[PDB]
Amino acid sequence: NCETSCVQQPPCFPLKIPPNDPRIKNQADCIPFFRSCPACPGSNITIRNQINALTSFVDASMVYGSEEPLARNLRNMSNQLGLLAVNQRFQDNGRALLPFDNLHDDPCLLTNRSARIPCFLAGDTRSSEMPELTSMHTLLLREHNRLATELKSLNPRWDGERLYQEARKIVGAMVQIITYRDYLPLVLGPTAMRKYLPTYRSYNDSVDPRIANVFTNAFRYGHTLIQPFMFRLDNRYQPMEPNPRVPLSRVFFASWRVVLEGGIDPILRGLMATPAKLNRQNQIAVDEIRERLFEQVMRIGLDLPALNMQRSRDHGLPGYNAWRRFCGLPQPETVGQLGTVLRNLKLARKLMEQYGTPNNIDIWMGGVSEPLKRKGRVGPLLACIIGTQFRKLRDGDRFWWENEGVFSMQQRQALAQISLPRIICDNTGITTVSKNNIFMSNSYPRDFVNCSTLPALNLASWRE
Amino acid sequence: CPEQDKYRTITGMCNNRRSPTLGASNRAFVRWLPAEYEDGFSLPYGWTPGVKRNGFPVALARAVSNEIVRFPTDQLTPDQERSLMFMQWGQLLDHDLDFTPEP
Ligand code: HEM
Ligand SMILES: Nc1cc(Cc2cnn(-c3ccc(F)cc3)c2)c2[nH]nnc2n1
Ligand SMILES: *[C@@H]1O[C@H](CO)[C@@H](O)[C@H](O)[C@H]1NC(C)=O
Ligand SMILES: [Ca+2]
Ligand SMILES: [Cl-]
Ligand SMILES: [Cl-]
Numbered sequence: 001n002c003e004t005s006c007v008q009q010p011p012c013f014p015l016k017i018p019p020n021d022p023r024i025k026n027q028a029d030c031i032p033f034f035r036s037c038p039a040c041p042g043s044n045i046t047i048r049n050q051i052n053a054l055t056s057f058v059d060a061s062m063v064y065g066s067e068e069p070l071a072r073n074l075r076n077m078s079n080q081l082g083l084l085a086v087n088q089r090f091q092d093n094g095r096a097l098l099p100f101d102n103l104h105d106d107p108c109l110l111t112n113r114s115a116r117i118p119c120f121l122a123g124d125t126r127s128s129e130m131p132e133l134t135s136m137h138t139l140l141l142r143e144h145n146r147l148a149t150e151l152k153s154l155n156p157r158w159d160g161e162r163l164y165q166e167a168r169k170i171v172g173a174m175v176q177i178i179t180y181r182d183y184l185p186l187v188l189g190p191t192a193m194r195k196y197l198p199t200y201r202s203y204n205d206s207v208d209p210r211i212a213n214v215f216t217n218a219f220r221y222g223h224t225l226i227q228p229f230m231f232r233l234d235n236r237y238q239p240m241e242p243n244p245r246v247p248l249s250r251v252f253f254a255s256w257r258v259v260l261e262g263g264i265d266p267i268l269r270g271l272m273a274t275p276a277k278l279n280r281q282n283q284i285a286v287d288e289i290r291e292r293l294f295e296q297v298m299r300i301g302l303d304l305p306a307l308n309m310q311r312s313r314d315h316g317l318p319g320y321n322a323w324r325r326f327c328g329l330p331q332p333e334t335v336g337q338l339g340t341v342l343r344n345l346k347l348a349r350k351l352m353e354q355y356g357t358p359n360n361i362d363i364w365m366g367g368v369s370e371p372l373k374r375k376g377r378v379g380p381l382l383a384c385i386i387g388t389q390f391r392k393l394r395d396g397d398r399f400w401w402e403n404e405g406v407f408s409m410q411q412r413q414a415l416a417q418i419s420l421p422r423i424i425c426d427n428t429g430i431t432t433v434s435k436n437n438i439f440m441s442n443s444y445p446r447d448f449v450n451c452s453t454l455p456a457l458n459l460a461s462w463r464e
Numbered sequence: 465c466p467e468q469d470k471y472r473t474i475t476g477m478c479n480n481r482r483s484p485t486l487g488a489s490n491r492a493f494v495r496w497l498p499a500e501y502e503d504g505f506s507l508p509y510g511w512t513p514g515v516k517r518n519g520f521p522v523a524l525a526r527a528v529s530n531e532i533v534r535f536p537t538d539q540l541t542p543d544q545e546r547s548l549m550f551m552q553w554g555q556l557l558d559h560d561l562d563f564t565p566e567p
Contacts, residue, residue: 011567013508018527022534031526034566038506039492047499048506049492053563055476056487062559064474066489071474124559132548136556165471172472175560183553186546205480209487210494211562219558225551228537276551278543283535290533305533309525313508316499319518326497347532354528356520365528377546393561396487398479399472420549434547442547 002034004299011035015303015310023291023301031303035314048316049213054124056211057397058179060171062124063140074123075164081152082163083145092263093429096142098122098134107297108255117256128255130248131230135258135267142427144171147459154463166462173401173415174423182420184390186439188383189376196387200394203403209396211389214323217312217364218385221378223304224279224368228288232262233269237432237444240266249292249301265428272424272434275442279377281347284368309362320366320381321359327384332358343371410461417455425451 002012006029015031017024024031036050054066063084065071076083087097101121108119108128119128122137148167152158158166185193229245239245240262251257258264277286285305293302321331332338335352339345347369355361361369370379378386399406401415421433431451434441441447465478472479476488485491500517502509509515510522543550 008511013511015526016524018524018530021526021530024526035508037565037567044505046505048501049495049499050564051490052493053490053565054559054561055474055489056561057472057476057479058557058560059472059476060560061474061476061489062556066475068474124563126559126563130555132552133555133559136552169471175557178553179557183550183557186550187554205482208494209480210491212496213493213499214496216493216562216564219554219562222551222554222558225543225546225554227542227548227551228540231548271549271552272547274548275542275544276546276548278541278546280541283539283541284533285535286540287534287537290529303526303529306525306529309528310508310510313510313522313525316501316508318497318500322497322500350532354523354531357518359518360520360522362525362528365532369532377543377550396480398481420553434549439547439550439553440545442543442545 002032004032006030013310013314015306029300031300031306031310032298033307033310033314036311050216050315052211052216056209056393057399058172058176058393059399060123060140060168060175062122062127062137063144063171064168065123070123074121077160080160080163082148082158082160082165082167084141084164086141086145090259092138092258092265095263095428096138096145097259097263098127098138098141101128107253107294110297111250111252111254112256112260115256115260117259119253119255128253131251131254131257131267132271134255135264135271138258138264139268139423139427140171143174143423144168146426147171147457150459151462154459158464170415170457172399173407174418176401177415177418178420180390180394182437182439186375186437187377188387189373189378192373192376192378192383192387196384196391197394200400200402203398203400204395205398207392207396209392212385213315214317214363214385215389217308217315217317218367218382219389220308220364221279221368221382221386223285223289223308225276225377226286226289227274227277228286230257230267231270231274232266233273234266237269237273237448247292248286248288249295252294253297265430268424268428268430272421272438273442273444273448279368279372281342281344281369281371305364308364312363317363319359320361320363321357323363323366323385324381327381329380329384342369408461414458414461418457419454421449422454422456425454426456 039049098120232240234240289304295301338348367382480486509517
């Protein structure tokens with residue numbers, strides 16, 4: 001009943017409205033919230049825990065799926081070419097698009113009623129959430145079919161199974177390399193990187209690769225990196241009219257913007273050439289997510305940071321000090337003490353007014369309040385939660401790309417040459433991509449290069 | 465559970481030969497610390513009015529959002545050293561790792 005009702009009866013845990021709220025003046029109203037599914041329903045023996053519906057590994061499961069029926073329904077089973085099924089109703093300038101998804105209460109149709117464009121079907125259920133996300137998804141779908149046709153030409157004897165698998169295995173490694181070589185060091189910074197992610201030695205069968213209940217919340221640090229507009233760019237990296245700076249409140253679930261507003265190319269151009277929002281202690285998250293999250297598709301605009309905090313409470317997560325204690329970090333008891341840790345007393349006074357004790361600060365709120373590490377975009381505590389989780393995902397992965405046996409010495413040497421700019425080259429009409437590192441490069445043309453200067457993935461090692 | 469294998473399963477089953485469900489889809493999360501619920505086992509802090517958490521009342525998530533998160537959209541400081549691709553690979557990455565179903 002959560003979608004409509006304000007009653008706090010299971011499984012509803014609605015966020016009540018404070019007096020003098022900047023948007024919701026009716027205090028009899030609320031923010032809708034469904035309590036996450038318990039791992040053990042109706043129990044009285046076990047302490048409530050939540051479920052992860054996906055594979056914890058960086059195995060490109062958002063492309064391929066985490067359940068066997070979906071994984072089948074995502075492939076093109078009409079031939080032994082080992083490709084992932086594409087949209088049969090539309091294409092982006094000749095280039096491939098994700099298939100549509102048959103949903104009972106499809107939210108993508110609500111973004112533009114007249115356009116009649118539904119949600120996409122990908123390895124993960126959240127594909128159509130923001131066009132920028134659907135772009136990354138479509139780029140990867142094109143990449144699988146790219147690598148699978150390059151492999152059929154090399155090894156024509158190979159069937160649809162070996163083609164799918166081998167291409168999946170390649171993509172799977174590609175996501176790992178981008179993540180560990182380029183993403184994470186820019187998240188953690190050099191020190192935490194050396195601390196939580198020292199040089200991989202080999203697979204440890206005694207490492208728990210599971211996602212910790214905390215990580216689900218801690219990793220939502222990214223909400224501080226969200227910009228309020230979708231920035232689209234033309235062939236010459238210039239604002240694309242009409243609608244160059246579209247408000248995010250209009251892009252959520254706007255799948256029609258990808259189909260009917262010029263495909264993947266301008267979005268990726270915008271993502272490469274626009275800087276991300278910087279987390280500041282007086283500038284945490286934008287009102288596009290704090291006030292208008294899913295405005296077009298819902299009875300009321302949601303507040304993502306409030307949802308994050310209610311979610312940790314739903315999840316039974318301990319407060320700030322307990323997590324600091326866990327991480328081996330000092331636990332401030334007073335306002336002054338807190339002001340010292342955060343290197344900001346203005347914020348600590350603010351946090352103390354709300355919580356009373358730094359023991360009660362909700363994990364996400366605490367984590368995002370911390371001053372950032374050197375050359376990093378997280379504070380000491382989040383660098384710990386995020387670091388630990390990523391090390392477990394690496395060291396506890398039997399199919400980790402660097403693991404002896406997974407690939408050959410040459411195969412490993414070939415995969416070491418991949419980059420996200422190069423993936424954008426091979427799968428779009430974009431001829432000018434970001435100079436590596438892609439995550440640091442944000443200015444056009446100071447930080448840009450031509451396709452020609454980028455070496456491609458040499459599939460020579462795969463020849464049988 | 466096969467003794468020799470070249471590829472991952474879709475579900476993540478068999479990545480860990482000793483405890484084969486570890487990392488696999490549709491399973492309970494691991495806990496790094498025991499859960500703090502209002503009744504010790506199921507009700508979240510904030511469920512019952514007047515029930516304090518560690519000696520203090522529970523602040524409304526929206527109230528915290530209003531007072532700490534809130535900032536004017538125009539004052540936005542852009543990252544000098546990070547593209548939006550960085551605040552997007554993160555979301556893509558997140559979707560390879562965890563999804564918490566609700567009813
Ligand atoms: C696309 C922009 C994004 C939107 C609109 C968005 C929206 C959401 C929403 C609505 C939820 C569910 C909130 C709840 O009910 O508790 C969610 C959860 C989440 N988000 Fe964001 N988010 C975005 C980007 C990101 C980014 C960039 C990161 C990380 C870098 C991130 C990490 C997460 C995680 C970990 C969760 C919980 C995942 C799970 O179900 O296990 N989000 N986000
Ligand atoms: N748990 C969630 C929830 C959301 C919100 C979301 C994403 N997709 N959907 C969705 C998808 C299909 C649908 F029929 C209804 C809702 C909702 C997330 N966005 N990014 N990561 C998310 N994790
Ligand atoms: C299957 O692949 C062939 C060849 O690429 C193509 O003609 C057909 O449309 C594909 N079908 C789907 C569902 O993608
Ligand atoms: Ca996965
Ligand atoms: Cl289709
Ligand atoms: Cl946990």
